[PDB]
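Reading group handout, session on sequence-to-structure problems. Before we discuss, look at one worked example. The prompt was deliberately terse, the way you'd type it at a terminal:

> structure UIC-1-L6M

The input record follows.
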Amino acid sequence: LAAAMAQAL
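And the output record:
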């Protein structure tokens, strides 16, 4: 989740 969300930005 951490990486996935960071990717969005």
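Points for discussion. First: The chain has one helix and no strands. Second: The helical segments are 2-8.
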